Swiss-Prot record:
It comes from Scomber japonicus (Chub mackerel). It comes from the Eukaryota. This is Parvalbumin beta. Keywords: Acetylation, Allergen, Calcium, Metal-binding, Muscle protein, Repeat. It holds the Pfam family EF-hand_7. Ca(2+) 2 binds at residues 92, 94, 96, 98, 103.
Amino acid sequence: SMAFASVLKDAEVTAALDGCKAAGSFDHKKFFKACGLSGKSTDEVKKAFAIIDQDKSGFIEEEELKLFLQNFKAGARALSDAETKAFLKAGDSDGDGKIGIDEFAAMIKG
Ligand SMILES: [Ca+2]
Ligand SMILES: [Ca+2]
């Protein structure tokens, strides 16, 4: 659902949601950089990591990664098998199958 709408501008993330609408065209970097998440404070990020976390499993398993579009909405599709892979290695620096916060704030911090 529109959670980030609180943190960021629902209208802002919107364009960030339509920017990925394109299959195999999802550019997380562009996304975070769009809403501004990229460069933001590592504090808020942790708060942005919840928006996504729908099961508060503590982490964002590879299965949750593809659910990086269900954070800004409760319906948005899920990154492809590759898209999720890119967004994985793009963040996960250990390639274990999950992306923690320290890692989630990394893909954005860098
Ligand atoms: Ca989670
Ligand atoms: Ca990890």
